[PDB]
Amino acid sequence: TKEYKDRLLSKQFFHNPQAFEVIPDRRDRAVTFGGKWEYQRTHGLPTVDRNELENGWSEVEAVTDAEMHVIEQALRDISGRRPGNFIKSPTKKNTLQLNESWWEPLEFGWEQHNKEQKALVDPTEQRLIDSASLPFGGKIPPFGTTIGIGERIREIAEDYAKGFGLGPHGHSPSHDTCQYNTLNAEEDRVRELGYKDALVRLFDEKMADKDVHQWAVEQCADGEADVRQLLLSLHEWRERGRPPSLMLLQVLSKYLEQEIAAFNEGVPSSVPKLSLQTVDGTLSPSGNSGERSGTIWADVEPTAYALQYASQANHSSLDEPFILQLLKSAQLGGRNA
């Protein structure tokens, strides 16, 4: 208030006047008529009267059991397992980039970012990192040799690659005993399945050579659907495996209807049948139990998806003249990398 501000102004002024002037004279310090300890009756800010201090709080809303159920629901929702934190995929396992100057030579995710640039982009304008310029053969040096550069590199790579969270068996992956991925059984399983989807597999085997722009300007009539949006979700669903969007899924329901029936012939009463139904806009394949598309996987890593997918090379991932492309590929054989 005015009282507070004024007591404060006199406090600051008699503590140092020369700061409250416009041409501040020299402020050397002189004696206090109180005694060598006048800070005892000058010190600290001014203090308010206590009854007002403690009472003068205006009544506060009783945020009620309603909002409480809301918020407790918020947390008991987020507490759920986000997917990969248990087993981090090479992208999060290798995205490391230390601001330290010893880190950048051994380009950390060199070979992984190479694999990603080889698989998921065109060979015509893209990068590739080399174990030649990379220090230790590009790979980490063995244990006994380097006086500790490779030591601390392995250790930072470890601690950035450690997986945390509960897994499907009920233990952090470094629990004392409950082992995971024993003899690489998880990548064994994920090979022996692959992340392969009925619906997009059928869309493939239907189009099977068409240019996506061609198919899209087909299925979108003049006013029926926007080619922008339908292309967008078409792609983001085709590669980078997602659940197909609402509009694109209905366009599929109409366009694939022949292959949809050919999938829906021999069902008995009880088995699943690929039913492109979007009763609720929940695209989670565990919400549909993986029927709105033929997906095992309730959420696939976009990039391991796209890795298997681009290894499925029926798409024209090589713009070359064709007989040359196949001649080079055959002659340079199966070890072409």
Binding site: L8, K11, Q12, H15, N16, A19, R26, R27, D28, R29, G35, K36, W37, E38, Y39, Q40, T42, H43, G44, L45, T47, V48, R50, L53, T95, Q97, N99, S101
Partner: protein
Amino acid sequence: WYLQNILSVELLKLPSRTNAEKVAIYRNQKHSLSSKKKGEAAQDDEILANIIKERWRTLEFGDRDAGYPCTFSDYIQFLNEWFKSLDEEGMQRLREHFDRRIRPLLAVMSPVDILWLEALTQNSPHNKEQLQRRIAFQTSLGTPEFFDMSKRLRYEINEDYKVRDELGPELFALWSKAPERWPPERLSKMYGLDFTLVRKILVWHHFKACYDACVEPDWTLPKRLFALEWIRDVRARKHGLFYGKMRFAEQKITFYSDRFLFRDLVNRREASYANVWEMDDPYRFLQTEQDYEDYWGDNYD
């Protein structure tokens, strides 16, 4: 030159932005998304201060007839008029300047950087050639980063409680409003550090705060926070006739059985207090006239 390259800042110009630059730095600042490059993060104030650092770095000394801003005589003459001008508070601010900038380097000084040091004012050491030779050999023996004193203070232990976020007094205007209702124990929750270091932060905090309100500090706050330690120093002195502060090498060598603290612990679990302030007030230690004199002996008033 000083007015020019320090106080006449407007005569400085920054790298003028492009508009893709403006929009994109806005877009990757006002929301830091995933997987950003490291090229969007160098701010214009850090850039202004780095440019002034380069100004002071490339200031050179010699007769001003050449392209030089000034000679050693000109510069130290200005220094002398100024250092005579300095009053108390001027000298507080200057000695803090020394303490934060130079003084931490005097301990990391090296007989390797004698060349670079004399380079600062462009002096010429007596053996400049024998130096350049060996100093080059030593600087060869270690990484170019391992020997540049421009980068020998770049890590701080306990990187979570930095000092840049304590120059604003935590809940300042709540304990500047009744510092009898606000002991150290109400804010010793604000820092997840050891207890002694937390009280140490708190007293430095009250100081930053009183200084900034430009009011007199209460130099009895360190005493009122470390009263136990205060009286223990007083009795340590009175016992072993020394002055200063007691160091752990002088402590008693009593070994307490595993559960010495049960008596104190039940007295603490049961003792309730008429209200909060009797529960925690700074004179809950002081029990006898010996305690009160060992406390207020320093305070002859």
